[PDB]
Design a protein around this ligand. Structure first.
Ligand SMILES: NC(=O)C1=CN([C@@H]2O[C@H](COP(=O)(O)OP(=O)(O)OC[C@H]3O[C@@H](n4cnc5c(N)ncnc54)[C@H](OP(=O)(O)O)[C@@H]3O)[C@@H](O)[C@H]2O)C=CC1
Ligand SMILES: CCCCCCCCCCCCCC(=O)SCCNC(=O)CCNC(=O)[C@@H](O)C(C)(C)COP(=O)(O)O
Ligand SMILES: [Zn+2]
Lengths: 134, 126, 95, 146, 297, 208, 86, 114
């Protein structure tokens, strides 16, 4: 187990459903011996003899710009074109629709409060679930 | 003549007495502070602020107090414009990131829309 | 209403006690852990509920200006008593 | 209100399996050495990676570059997106391409296979604001959720 | 690993080093600089003291508030030893006397008290135990000091099998009894070869032995970088000090050559560069002032 | 508005406005602004090349005679490109009056020392060197006056932190007081005290 | 050992990306049909210069500037990338 | 871009003043080691002087190096006149400060600082 940082514990790039890259800021530091996540992976790469070419967060973001440059343009929605080409590629394989009806996994407010590991560890979300199940 | 021409970039880092660890490893954040959503007042969103990245706060073994080793942990600077803050950060060798001012966009308010004939914007109570 | 951990250390009214494997118990070695044994949560539970004939009661904590700011407590719930948010004295409408 | 889960059940120290098969606390040197000794013995499809729901892009490209040094492209997510056709090559076929704000510009919204009230509650709030103020027509293909 | 003993901070005075140390014999020469170097990291240091509390006053500025806990102890009282060690994760033994007293001989100070501290620390669950022997400790030694210190090393090794035993040769510093002994003797010159080690090197070696998990069960020999004959060493001391209490056991130990033990690890295996005498003899012997260096072998 | 409100002194306001006009038209080479506050204090905001000609005027002119240098002050305002605001407070005992002379500099432009006008300035601008880093040219003995001898930085700059960068303790190994990077057992707790509601509409700045 | 992914960065509006846009509007579909299991990541951004990243085996990445190219020049550079596999 | 100088019109006069300040510190180091009865050598103090001069070697602004020469002359005046004590002279030698972790991996081990 490699203890990592949570989203309040690291300056960290997350991209929402519309493509807007955004960064968190460090509010508190990680508890105990837990570390920032890419710091852990970079330390592992140095132990393994395959050391990655970044040392600071800015150098990770330079690599992140090299892989796709919209991940470091924060509070910017980059428009994505080429729906016609993706549509032409989607007409190649004729996948069959199943007869099962479209059922979302969250039907009521009961299924809302616990989705990830932070919400499942929350006593407040547990009181919300217990309050809506009664 | 009594004036010289210095075309160099303005850099005072060797004069400020700041140790090097708190120049080249700090990230200044230049931003208009967000409105406290507990309150409708907007007078705290008028000026630009420069803060730094929060460093480690740990528990004092004797009292449980929040101990820090960051000298810049309470340093918040106030600027009238974004460009003054950028010039002050570049002058001091601080690597910075700038968030743009987020103004609330103008809303279309009509009290008569509470009582429309055929629109969904009727209030069910008042 | 003080109690004792299995280490022998007294638990404060907050609920603070060091763990058995916590090194910080060494500060009490040869010395004492100062606790107050008059727990305010137990002493305000000893006060009887004041039966009043009004719908709204006022509490200032006694002593007038020596108490707390004067607040007004509604007593419409018959299931629950009306508790002062400052001093913890509780009230019940007698009807 | 989920921030109080952020101070429970927390991983605070590196853990490794002992001789009994139980997770015991250890240092960063020992844990990273025991991971890196296994990473050096892998190549190709011998090592893979699953990204969770809360992972930032820095750790994502960190572990991607690390597994690419081992010549592994098997870096997966838990949430399935179909790779048929264009896949994830074009960004447009996996984005909310209109915008969250573009809901205020729409006049007909077709929701397919989603419960946006709980999957993306403020996207649903933007749909309700467009419903209320712009007389938006919303249709749903799926179970009749509220 | 408990949450209160996780290291935090930048290693300064208000930081948490995660070291909870009980230093027996902290009121002496080595304990002074050991509590200094522990307290500047932000370690919890337990000082059991036998002496007047006045004589512990100099240990009080060495750490942050609550980071040095003073408590009474007796060498023949296992209850006080258990009272001092039961919260610590490292116990260092620095108990020593150059002379035997009416109440404590060399067997009490070097055999009985170290075995008592090591046994009580073993049965209290202390992780790390550091014991300080002497480099010239031998069963067949001519001095009672080195004989009892070899016996005590053997008993510490057999009752705490993971103890780090350290062999300093002859420690010099401002409060030593090696250069200050030679500067105030105003005994002779023989064929004795010595390599004296500096006190901050010994302290850095002890604290690196705390932090190294590979130092458990080892026996280290802390020696200086330069071996000197006794005669030109004493002449170098009288040359630096600008010059033209003892017992026969101390005379037997001054005329005992510092043995060479290449099979034991030293200061370099703990990451400590051994400081030569010529850089630090002026710092010691400046007090004795009212220079060509010594020849090495 | 009688009991709780400070009474306004219109006579002194009119007199200080007339004397500010007087100074501004005698010395137009250096005077940039002249203002009188609502509590009747006169400020002459000048160009820094006129430190010596303005202050020698106010010291020596028969209608000014500001013989006393009450105080000499810098103010750090980091949003200005000339961040330091050098403030002279002068007292005329003849006309029973006070005047404020304000000028500006950045970190690198020297201000001319006014020791040849007021010898009182000798320590004050020396303090401005120690606290703010403003160099004063042609000063007799310009050096630090208040900080410790090896002190790095200028403490009354607003980007200098409240606790410094180093702290002292006695170290018994080196037998010496030593300087180390500052660690606080309790961090200074920053209070965000400003109300988000406007307090004074008379001081409202015009928007963008 | 071989090519692992291709990354094509381009602008939506700049003229220097224009031929690169002319590569994707016309020649990307049969490229993807020719290489079905090769990830060819098209990444549009606001003001970037056009660029062709070729990641090879064991993390090796080559870098080709596609600035001010025509669609034929982008096609030739990309088929040099596909035929090299170094 | 037309600024008022402090002492130097350009960088050559500035380097002249830097060079004279270095000469004065180089002459002063043996007297400083003697009268403060320091435990360092003259070579070690001159290496510290060379380190403090090379720390500022990247500056290209004449006003900034004029202020650096002014502050170095102030430090030298505080050293020649016995205004500093032994502690202030030895603060240039960070002897009680433990060596900071330099590489990535040891900084990763000890904490969160980049
Ligand atoms: N040259 C050297 O210094 C060398 C020393 N060593 C060993 O290192 C250790 C520490 O050396 P050092 O600091 O110089 O010695 P000191 O004589 O200066 O200090 C020894 C410490 O042990 C305590 N002590 C002594 N006798 C007793 C006793 N009977 N009961 C309880 N406490 C006692 C003393 O306390 P109090 O003040 O109350 O008497 C003091 O704190 C010793 O074991 C010594 O043999 C090894 C090699 C070289
Ligand atoms: C005992 C301890 C005592 C410590 C003494 C502290 C004194 C500190 C004084 C600091 C004064 C300076 O650093 S001023 C130097 C700044 N100069 C510059 O930026 C210009 C570049 N200067 C140089 O490169 C200098 O080496 C030279 C000699 C002027 C030119 O060399 P280049 O040619 O190759
Ligand atoms: Zn009350």
């Amino acid at each position: 187990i490699l203890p990592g940082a949570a989203y309040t514990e690291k300056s960290a790039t997350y991209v929402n459903t519309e493509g807007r890259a955004q960064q968190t800021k460090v509010a508190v530091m990680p508890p105990g011996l837990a570390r920032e996540d890419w710091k852990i992976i970079r330390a592992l790469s140095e132990i393994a003899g395959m050391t990655l070419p970044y040392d600071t967060l800015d150098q990770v973001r330079n690599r992140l710009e090299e892989v796709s440059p919209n991940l470091v343009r924060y509070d910017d929605v980059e428009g994505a074109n080429y729906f016609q080409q993706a549509s032409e590629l989607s007409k190649l394989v004729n996948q069959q629709l199943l007869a099962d009806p479209l059922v979302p996994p969250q039907l009521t407010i009961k299924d809302f409060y616990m989705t990830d590991s932070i919400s499942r560890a929350s006593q407040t979300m547990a009181k919300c679930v217990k309050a809506v199940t009664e | 003549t009594q004036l010289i021409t210095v075309d160099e970039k303005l850099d005072i880092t060797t004069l400020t007495g700041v140790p090097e660890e708190h120049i080249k490893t700090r990230k200044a954040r230049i931003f208009v502070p967000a409105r406290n959503n507990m309150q409708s007042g907007v007078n705290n969103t008028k000026k630009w602020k420069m803060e730094f990245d929060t460093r480690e706060r740990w528990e004092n073994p004797l009292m449980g107090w929040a101990s820090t080793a960051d000298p810049l942990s309470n340093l918040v600077l106030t600027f009238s414009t974004k460009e003054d803050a950028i010039a002050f950060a570049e002058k001091n060798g601080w690597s910075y990131d700038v968030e743009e001012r987020k103004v609330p966009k103008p809303k279309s308010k009509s009290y008569g829309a509470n009582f429309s004939w055929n629109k969904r914007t009727r209030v069910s109570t008042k | 209403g003080v109690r004792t951990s299995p280490t022998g250390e007294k638990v404060t009214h907050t609920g603070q006690v060091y763990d058995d494997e916590d090194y910080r118990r060494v500060r009490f070695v040869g010395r004492q852990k100062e606790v107050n044994e008059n727990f305010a949560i137990d002493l305000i539970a000893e006060q009887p509920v004041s039966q009043v004939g009004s719908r709204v009661i006022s509490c200032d904590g006694g002593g007038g200006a020596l108490g707390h700011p004067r607040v007004y407590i509604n007593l419409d719930k018959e299931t629950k008593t009306g508790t002062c948010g400052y001093c913890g004295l509780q009230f019940r409408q007698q009807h | 209100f989920a921030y109080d889960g952020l101070k429970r059940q927390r991983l605070t120290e590196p853990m490794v399996r002992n001789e009994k098969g139980l997770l015991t606390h250890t240092t960063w040197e020992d844990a990273l050495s025991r991971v890196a000794g296994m990473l050096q013995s892998c190549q190709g499809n011998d090592v893979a990676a699953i990204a969770g729901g809360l992972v930032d892009a820095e750790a994502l490209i960190a572990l991607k570059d690390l597994l690419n040094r081992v010549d592994s492209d098997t870096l997966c997510t838990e949430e399935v997106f179909p790779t048929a056709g264009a896949g994830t090559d074009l960004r447009s076929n996996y984005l909310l391409n209109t915008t969250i704000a573009g809901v205020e510009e729409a006049d007909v919204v077709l929701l397919v296979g989603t419960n946006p009230r709980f999957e993306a509650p403020l996207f649903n709030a933007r749909i309700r604001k467009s419903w209320l103020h712009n007389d938006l027509k919303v249709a749903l293909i799926g179970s009749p959720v509220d | 690993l408990h949450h209160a003993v996780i290291p935090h901070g930048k290693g300064g005075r208000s930081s948490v080093s995660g070291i909870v140390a009980t230093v027996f014999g902290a009121t002496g020469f080595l304990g002074r600089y050991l509590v200094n170097h522990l307290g500047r990291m932000g370690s919890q240091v337990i000082v059991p003291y036998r002496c007047e509390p006045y004589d512990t006053m100099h240990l009080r500025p060495m750490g942050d508030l609550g980071q040095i806990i003073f408590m009474d102890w007796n060498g023949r009282d296992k209850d006080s030893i258990r009272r001092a060690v039961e919260h610590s994760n490292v116990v260092i033994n620095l108990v020593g006397r150059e002379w035997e007293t009416k109440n404590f001989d060399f067997e009490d100070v070097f055999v009985k008290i170290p075995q008592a501290i090591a046994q009580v620390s073993k049965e209290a669950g202390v992780e790390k135990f550091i014991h300080i022997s002497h480099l010239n400790a031998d069963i067949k030694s001519s001095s009672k000091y080195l004989r009892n210190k070899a016996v005590g090393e053997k008993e510490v090794r057999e009752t705490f099998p993971e103890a780090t035993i350290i062999k300093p040769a002859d420690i010099f510093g401002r409060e030593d009894r090696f250069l200050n002994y030679f500067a105030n003797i105003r005994s002779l010159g023989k064929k004795t070869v010595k390599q004296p080690v500096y006190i901050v090197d010994v302290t850095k070696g002890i604290i690196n032995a705390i932090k190294d998990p590979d130092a458990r069960g080892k026996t280290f020999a802390f020696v200086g970088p330069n071996r000197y004959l006794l005669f030109d060493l004493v002449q170098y001391v009288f040359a630096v000090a600008h010059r033209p209490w003892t017992t026969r056991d101390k005379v037997e130990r001054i005329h005992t050559t510092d043995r060479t033990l290449p099979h034991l690890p030293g200061l370099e295996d703990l990451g400590v560069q051994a400081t030569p005498l010529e850089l630090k003899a002026i710092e010691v012997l400046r007090r004795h002032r009212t220079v060509q260096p010594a020849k090495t072998v | 508005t009688r009991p709780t409100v400070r009474p306004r002194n219109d006579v002194a306001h009119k007199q200080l406005s007339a004397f500010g006009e007087y100074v501004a038209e005698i010395l137009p080479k250096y005077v940039q602004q002249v203002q009188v506050s609502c509590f009747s204090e006169l400020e002459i905001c000048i160009h820094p090349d006129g430190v010596i000609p303005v202050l020698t005027f106010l010291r020596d002119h028969s209608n000014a005679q500001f013989k006393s240098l009450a105080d000499l002050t810098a103010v750090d305002i980091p949003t200005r490109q000339n961040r330091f605001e050098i403030v002279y407070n002068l007292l005329s005992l003849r006309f029973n009056s006070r005047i404020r002379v304000k000028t500006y500099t950045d970190e690198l432009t020297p201000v001319e020392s006014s020791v040849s006008v007021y010898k009182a300035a000798n320590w004050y601008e020396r303090e401005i060197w120690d606290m703010f880093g403003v160099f004063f040219a042609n000063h007799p003995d310009l050096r630090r006056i208040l900080t410790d001898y090896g002190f790095e930085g200028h403490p009354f700059r607003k980007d200098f932190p409240l606790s410094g960068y180093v702290e002292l303790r006695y170290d018994d190994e080196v037998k010496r007081v030593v300087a180390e990077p500052v660690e606080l057992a309790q961090e200074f707790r920053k209070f965000d005290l400003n109300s988000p509601w406007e307090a004074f509409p008379a001081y409202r700045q015009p928007p963008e | 050992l071989g090519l692992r992914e291709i990354r094509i960065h381009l602008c939506q509006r700049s003229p220097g990306s224009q031929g690169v846009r002319d590569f994707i509007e016309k020649r990307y579909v049969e490229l993807k049909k020719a290489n079905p299991d090769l990830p060819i990541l098209i990444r549009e951004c606001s003001d970037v210069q056009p660029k062709l990243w070729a990641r090879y085996a064991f993390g090796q990445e080559k870098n080709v500037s596609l600035n001010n190219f025509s669609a034929d020049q982008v096609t030739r550079a990309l088929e040099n990338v596909l035929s090299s596999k170094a | 871009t037309s600024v008022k100088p402090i002492f130097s019109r350009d960088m050559n006069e500035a380097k002249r003043r830097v060079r004279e300040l270095y000469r004065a510190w180089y002459r002063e180091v043996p007297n400083t080691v003697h009268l403060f009865q320091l435990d360092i050598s003259v070579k070690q103090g001159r290496d510290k002087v060379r380190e403090m001069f090379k720390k500022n070697a990247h500056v290209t602004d004449p006003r900034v190096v004029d202020l650096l020469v002014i502050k170095g002359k102030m430090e030298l005046e505080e050293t020649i006149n016995v205004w500093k004590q032994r502690t202030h002279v030895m603060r240039f030698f960070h002897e009680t400060e433990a060596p900071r972790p330099k590489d990535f991996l040891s900084k990763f081990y000890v904490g969160h600082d980049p």
